[PDB]
Paper text:
Sterile alpha motif and HD domain-containing protein 1 (SAMHD1) is a metal-dependent hydrolase that plays key roles in dNTP homeostasis, antiretroviral defense, and regulation of various cancers in humans. In this study, we bioinformatically mined the SAMHD1 superfamily and selected the ortholog from the mycorrhizal fungus Rhizophagus irregularis as a model system for both fungal and biochemically intractable plant SAMHD1s. Ri SAMHD1 retains the substrate promiscuity of the human enzyme but bypasses the strict requirement for allosteric activation through tetramerization, positioning it as a prototypical enzyme in which hydrolysis and allosteric regulation can be uncoupled. In this study, we present the first three-dimensional structure of the fungal Ri SAMHD1 and detail its activity profile, active site chemical makeup, and regulatory activation/inhibition mechanisms.
Ri SAMHD1 was expressed under various metal supplementation conditions, and only the protein produced from minimal media promoting Mn incorporation yielded well-diffracting crystals. The symmetry of the tetramer resembles that observed for Hs SAMHD1 demonstrating similar assembly and subunit contacts. Ri and Hs SAMHD1 share 53% sequence identity and are structurally homologous with a root-mean-square deviation of 0.981 Å. The active site contains a single Mn ion coordinated by four residues, including the HD dyad (i.e., H64, H103, D104, and D192), a configuration identical to that of the Fe-bound structures of Hs SAMHD1, whether mononuclear or dinuclear.30,34−36 Although Ri lacks a second metal ion, H129 – the counterpart of H233, which coordinates the Mg ion in the Fe–Mg site of Hs SAMHD1 – is similarly positioned in terms of distance and orientation. While a second Mn ion was not detectable in our structure, an additional weak electron density was present near the Mn ion, that was best fitted with a pyrophosphate molecule. In the Ri SAMHD1 tetramer, only one nucleotide (GTP) is positioned within the interface of three subunits (A, B, and D), forming an extensive network of hydrogen-bonding interactions with residues from the two allosteric sites. The GTP primarily interacts with D34, Q39, and R42 of subunit A (AL1), forming five hydrogen-bonding interactions with the Watson–Crick and the G base Hoogsteen (N7) sites. The GTP is coordinated via its phosphate oxygens in a tridentate fashion to a metal ion, which, on the basis of the absence of any anomalous scattering, cannot be assigned to Mn (added in excess) or another transition metal. Given that the coordination geometry deviates from the typical octahedral arrangement found in Mg ions and coupled with the minimal presence of Mg in our samples, we have assigned this metal to a calcium ion. Overall, the allosteric sites are arranged similarly to those in the human enzyme, with the most notable differences being the presence of a calcium ion and the absence of a second nucleotide effector.
Residue numbers in the entry:
A (entry chain C): 11 to 390, 392 to 451
B (entry chain B): 11 to 387, 389 to 451
C (entry chain A): 11 to 372, 374 to 451
D (entry chain D): 11 to 451
Write the structure that this text describes.
Amino acid sequence: KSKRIQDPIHGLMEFDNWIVKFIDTEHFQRLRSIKQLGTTYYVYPGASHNRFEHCLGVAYLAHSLVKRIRETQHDLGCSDKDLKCVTLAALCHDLGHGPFSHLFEVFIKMRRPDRKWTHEEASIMMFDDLLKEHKEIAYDLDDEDKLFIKDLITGKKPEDTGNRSPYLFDVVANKRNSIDVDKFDYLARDCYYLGMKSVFDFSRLMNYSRVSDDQITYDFKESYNIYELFHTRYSLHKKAYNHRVGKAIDYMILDALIAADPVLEISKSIDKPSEYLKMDDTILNRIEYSDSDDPDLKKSKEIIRRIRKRDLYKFVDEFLVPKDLKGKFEKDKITKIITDQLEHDGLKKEYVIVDILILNYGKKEENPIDNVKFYDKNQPLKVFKLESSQVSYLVPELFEELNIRIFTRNRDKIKQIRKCFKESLTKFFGIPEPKTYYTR
Amino acid sequence: KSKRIQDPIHGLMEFDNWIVKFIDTEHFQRLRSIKQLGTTYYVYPGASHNRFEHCLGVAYLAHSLVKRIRETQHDLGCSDKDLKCVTLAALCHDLGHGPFSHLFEVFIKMRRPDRKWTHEEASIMMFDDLLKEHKEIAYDLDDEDKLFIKDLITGKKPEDTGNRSPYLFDVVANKRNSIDVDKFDYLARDCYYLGMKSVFDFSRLMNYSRVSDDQITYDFKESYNIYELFHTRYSLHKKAYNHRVGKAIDYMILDALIAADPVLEISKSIDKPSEYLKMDDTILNRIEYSDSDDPDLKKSKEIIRRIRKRDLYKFVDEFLVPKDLKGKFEKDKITKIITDQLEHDGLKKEYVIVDILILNYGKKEENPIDNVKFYDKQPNLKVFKLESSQVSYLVPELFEELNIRIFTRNRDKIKQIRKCFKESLTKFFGIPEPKTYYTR
Amino acid sequence: KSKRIQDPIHGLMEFDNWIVKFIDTEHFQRLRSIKQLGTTYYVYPGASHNRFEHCLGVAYLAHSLVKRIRETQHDLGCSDKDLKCVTLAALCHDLGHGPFSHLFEVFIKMRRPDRKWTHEEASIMMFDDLLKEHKEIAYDLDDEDKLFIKDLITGKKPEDTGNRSPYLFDVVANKRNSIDVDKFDYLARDCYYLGMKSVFDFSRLMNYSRVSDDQITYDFKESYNIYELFHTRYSLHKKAYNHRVGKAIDYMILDALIAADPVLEISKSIDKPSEYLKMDDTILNRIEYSDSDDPDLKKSKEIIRRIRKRDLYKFVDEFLVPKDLKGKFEKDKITKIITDQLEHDGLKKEYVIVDILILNYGKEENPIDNVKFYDKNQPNLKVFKLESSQVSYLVPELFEELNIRIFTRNRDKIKQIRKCFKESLTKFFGIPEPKTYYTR
Amino acid sequence: KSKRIQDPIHGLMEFDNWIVKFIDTEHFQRLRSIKQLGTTYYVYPGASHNRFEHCLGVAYLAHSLVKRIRETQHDLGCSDKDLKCVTLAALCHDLGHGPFSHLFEVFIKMRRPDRKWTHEEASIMMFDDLLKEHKEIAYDLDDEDKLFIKDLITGKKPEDTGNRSPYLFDVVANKRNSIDVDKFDYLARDCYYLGMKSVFDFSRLMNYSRVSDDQITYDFKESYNIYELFHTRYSLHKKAYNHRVGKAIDYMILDALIAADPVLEISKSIDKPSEYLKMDDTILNRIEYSDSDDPDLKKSKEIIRRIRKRDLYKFVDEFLVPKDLKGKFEKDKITKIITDQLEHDGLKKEYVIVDILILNYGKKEENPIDNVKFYDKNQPNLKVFKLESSQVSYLVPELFEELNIRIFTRNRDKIKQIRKCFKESLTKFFGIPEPKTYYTR
Ligand SMILES: Nc1nc2c(ncn2[C@@H]2O[C@H](COP(=O)(O)OP(=O)(O)OP(=O)(O)O)[C@@H](O)[C@H]2O)c(=O)[nH]1
Ligand SMILES: Nc1nc2c(ncn2[C@@H]2O[C@H](COP(=O)(O)OP(=O)(O)OP(=O)(O)O)[C@@H](O)[C@H]2O)c(=O)[nH]1
Ligand SMILES: Nc1nc2c(ncn2[C@@H]2O[C@H](COP(=O)(O)OP(=O)(O)OP(=O)(O)O)[C@@H](O)[C@H]2O)c(=O)[nH]1
Ligand SMILES: Nc1nc2c(ncn2[C@@H]2O[C@H](COP(=O)(O)OP(=O)(O)OP(=O)(O)O)[C@@H](O)[C@H]2O)c(=O)[nH]1
Ligand SMILES: [Ca+2]
Ligand SMILES: [Ca+2]
Ligand SMILES: [Ca+2]
Ligand SMILES: [Ca+2]
Ligand SMILES: [Mn+2]
Ligand SMILES: [Mn+2]
Ligand SMILES: [Mn+2]
Ligand SMILES: [Mn+2]
């Protein structure tokens, strides 16, 4: 009946036999071969964790959070089916992730930019395919139930929630608060495995929440803890997720996948669920260990061998554009002028890689503790909202960061591309003195 | 002939006999009876630690850091005597702390305002008496070495450093960076004992620093870690150090010390070292259990019995002043108006307590990382200071935050003076509807 | 009403309003000044915790355990009244501890050996006085319920459990198994504060237990966890509790209390609860800082100054008896021949101290004795006992250890007393060569 | 030059540039695709770590320890070459590990028992190939240094260590104490990743040791800490390393490997370095993601399919032999009685699996604390001594060598039936009329 999974983050998690059925499926077990942080493992060797174990924690969190809500608020009318759908939604929210997680999206964009593929779109396809091949374990699931699970995976804004337990949309994919149990898991899981520390305490948000006004409301004593949630995500982005060598290795993995695409048809595995079953991170080993004499795979094997020998794409120069010049930036425009500068004075454009780095705290430029409602235990008083002049705390110095990083495929000539970077910056942005991150 | 002391933060601490004899002085062992966090133990039962164990950690960190500097930079001319002086400075930096730690500094502030007594001065007096009664253990120290220890304890600004190893002044009492091993210990110690998490890693700061420009410079990779030093301290202030009930219990202690002062001469103990040797946290127990029928001591026991019954001074409300009204504030000027407001409607002044809270991200109002010089293991020309864009992270919204907190010695008139605080706020130099802490 | 208290081991413990009424009493608040490990703080600086916080954890653990039992086994009939009794028993079990915890028990044994006093008896008396002094609290409990609480504080053998929830006797003071939530707290709290590690995990024993056969049964997969409970207690005794310098300072505190006993009536405070409320660890400070001219206070003050100066009683030698000579041992007899040996061939007998050390793993019982198990894998309701032939794990080399440790009050001579010990061993025991620990 | 690598166990690890060139070889980076705990990840999802990160820590600890010895005991004569040699042994001590670690040894033994191939032999084979294909990075090593490095990986008894710094054999593969920095790392790394606790503190063992009598001696105050090293490893075996379902999936992987061997020739990979370079855990995916219709491949594909659907081999029962009955026991002889009993009154023997579990507190039935020499800081004149019941009392295993007979079934419908045959064959093998198995109540 009930199962028990030992996890370093959540301890011992209990899953009912109903949950276990969807777990013991080739669709979900596929997540064991998909790394949670992609190429971070190649810079932070502790980041070996996969999306499989992360999804178990989100399902455990969502099930127990909704179970606490149902039992403490019996007048809410939340049914057993509502608890089952939110548990399946949490369990299958990352089912559609591809090899190296978000990097597969960039790969498919570079290959088929018109398909507009995204990982949670594949989550819908994989969820349906699991229900088709294992309809026995989903006998109790209705057609309106099946769409409920899919709508919770993607999340809905507070205006288009409907009448099917609107607070349940705050659990897995939060569009109003961005405070969800999925973030509770990976923030702590990645912190644990990267060997990093965090102040945010998700257990207090797990137990000291409540449902009011069709939304999950939190104790007003937890306001600074909610601050530390997005602070942990901000710090994780600034310390590990956006590491420069990790991005250089990311572009090498892309060039390898592109080269091996015509023979293996990697960018086509997303068209069929049967083909997506076999797509995971082991594709890198398949290319590496391929003995074929195809010039595509030979180029792809060379890039993979370059990873193993640490002969990676080197960094050239970085530039943070000021907020005053943010309006003039354009990814396609800045790429053309830079490549023209290499073509005019320099070498081939094949060497240079123009990378864009967008760091957004919260939702765009929105402050923390926005659209979240608070309560007081003493006053059993309507939900309230704290004003900007009522609470102060730590804040990101720059809410929106625009960084134009330059990588070179060839490690021979870096100083010439570094000079060419300043030449392109002074005539696109007009700044006579481009204050690049490598100042003089 | 050394001694290894086991500690939950630093593991096995190694102490040689030259300082062990200093640790085995009744002057140092007095710190066993002075809690590190004063009255925080009454709200956080885990905060049981005292200043004695903290000072052992600081002495351990100062000795190991300076020993590494001596073993890695032989050209600095740092002697074994210089190792002794900075180690002794660390051990005795908190020697002059009184009962309930900083609570005693504000007790003497009322009783003897002209004295302007600080625990840094008592540390000098206590250190002097230590050498007076234990001159057998200070035979190799001259007055120059003695005066060096005094200066290291008080800390000196970079300009007033002299040529007696100016870099050593950054070790125990940093007046330039605020990055000292004292902060290293108690931040890790308080987090461990309070049960709160920290984002700071002091071991990295200990192992990745070098001496240059007559100061302590840090690796560029530790820039984020330096931010998390003050992040951790800020969060600790916002959650534990400045707890409202902690200050409520504080004001009770001050009142009880005031009533017992004409009988016990508590405020006079800071004048003679042999009188100060008998002054610690236990004076509350001595007053509580004393059976004398003195009228001045009767009120002290009544206040102390109020603590045991948790019939404490009740928090009423607090007001976070806006940035625009900071210059419009004056502590003594505003206290007049709430005194006049209470005698109009309500009761007498004896029930209200006005409290000022100054929360500082680092000493005073400045970003402390702007005073840290860094080095990049691509050897830069000289040690450099981080520019505006070289690094961006979590900055405080208000570097200096002023909070007007209102406490009452009567628990029944919580709403009569909650109004009078708002009427005083709205009538003093403010706004039609003040937004205090409990306004919604 | 309900209050939550942060604890570094249990996180956030919630106490109902009826529990807070007991906490907010001078009887219970007295435990704030009763160190959990007595003089261990003088060897392990991290052991600054008190009996106050330990008691909160036992109450939280006991309450949470028995409440989960009723919510999962409704057929048991465990009423809300029984939940109240076992929670109070856990909260007040250590209410009778005196200064330095168990050390005070040895002190009263040496002073009034005919009283046969124990802190449990003082815990009942402190519980009776608490109710007498607070008539407004604890209205639900009747006289029969008051007897139940006292019986749970002392514990009862399975033959005298009665007919009112006999399983509840396993929660606080377990006599048939010794597996209780009291050990769950201090094993973890002492490890945390001493800076030690343990394999035992009380949380697994908390949520995976079942009540049957009028007792508390456990999952048979936790049989090795039960092994590690008693392993952790055995390891804590062998590493911290029984430290040789800890016992040396123990005798110093005892000698000082003896001198001051006629004046201060320390050993007589266990007769009147009103006198016992002022009996806490700060009594050492009142003696140390006394200005009285009585000769015993000077003798008491001189010993305390020896503690601060670290001129402690020096450990001379220690001898472990073999199993075949255990029966030929008697504390009074071996002390006499050692005393007579010092008197004839040596110095004054006041120098030598003869200390017995008994270390029992659990008598000589096996750690899985008398605990019944249920199989969660196969759905079952019957309990079973694991035979010794179907389990194998770690086990102490010596289940019972008897050591004769000798300390001297005079550190001028040691080798002389050490020689008298060896000659007394050959005269009291038939061995010609003494297998002491200071052989070489 | 030097590089700093962040690790959750050791924090920041520094590596000199010469060590980095070995790390950045395809032979070392292959360990990124080999799980440290084999199939344990299928039971404990936190145990996702690979041999690459574990070997990084071991080389870091081995370098730190030996570097300290050279700086605190100049008179020993430990050369830079010696420090280079032991660090390389630590980095390559797991170089020849096959897919799912210890599982591959059983696959070679089952397929080719005459070879008796061990991953130390493959470690030798892949270490020689590492230097052959990267000769520019090993220019300073001579033939004797290579023999020094190779022997440090295996380890040597105290009677077989020469005069070339014999204490260094205690750093990576300790044959006298079993106290090496290999255990220092994976004991902590496995606990951190499985989500389990440990009483051992390897930091104390790293700094409170001293070399004398051609060995590594430990401070007297660390005697309890040493006991907890083997306490932690013993506890890790009883809950994680020897999990029944982990062993059940171990046999599933084996059956699928034998079934796929005629087509993929997996067992031949242990012969040529170039082929073993492609040998890692990913072969589980290549077999299940192939598309050929070979009947041998179809049999292995089904086994992998039952892994994903948790239609695994079911644990039947376990029998701990008594100490008296341990002398009268033989693996091949007891197995015949069980198959004969199942072929008599049951179904075919293809469903039953006979597994013999051997748990050692040390290496065999010796106590490793009896082979470590201790010293005293307050008595430096006193020669290093062994523990001789003088303050030597702690927790020891009841059986220093635990022998367990476990039965697995390939079909879950015959669990109760095979359970009877296990007790039947137990009665006709041992002189025990009523055997008390694991599931007997
Ligand atoms: N070299 C190397 N670094 C690793 C490896 N695994 C994790 N890392 C970490 O990831 C980071 C990658 O940086 P580098 O390997 O130096 O890449 P790079 O900066 O282009 O190379 P350099 O220009 O020589 O510094 C390193 O600093 C390591 O801390 C590995 O296998 N090899
Ligand atoms: N001296 C001293 N030791 C402390 C103190 N706090 C904790 N300890 C620990 O207590 C242990 C025992 O104290 P010792 O000073 O060694 O007592 P002792 O063994 O009788 O004295 P010695 O003759 O110097 O060895 C030491 O090893 C320290 O690790 C302290 O404040 N002073
Ligand atoms: N009452 C009480 N609280 C404690 C104690 N120890 C720690 N605390 C914590 O300290 C916090 C302070 O709250 P209270 O003691 O109730 O003080 P208060 O808020 O002024 O009192 P109330 O108005 O009744 O809430 C509590 O929330 C507890 O979590 C204790 O011994 N008694
Ligand atoms: N079912 C299942 N168990 C897992 C999984 N991952 C880890 N485990 C753990 O492995 C343990 C044993 O696996 P089980 O699925 O129970 O397989 P089994 O014990 O041989 O057979 P059953 O208990 O009848 O299901 C479980 O108790 C889980 O804690 C998983 O993905 N599915
Ligand atoms: Ca309150
Ligand atoms: Ca000593
Ligand atoms: Ca099972
Ligand atoms: Ca680099
Ligand atoms: Mn996710
Ligand atoms: Mn300090
Ligand atoms: Mn207790
Ligand atoms: Mn290894």
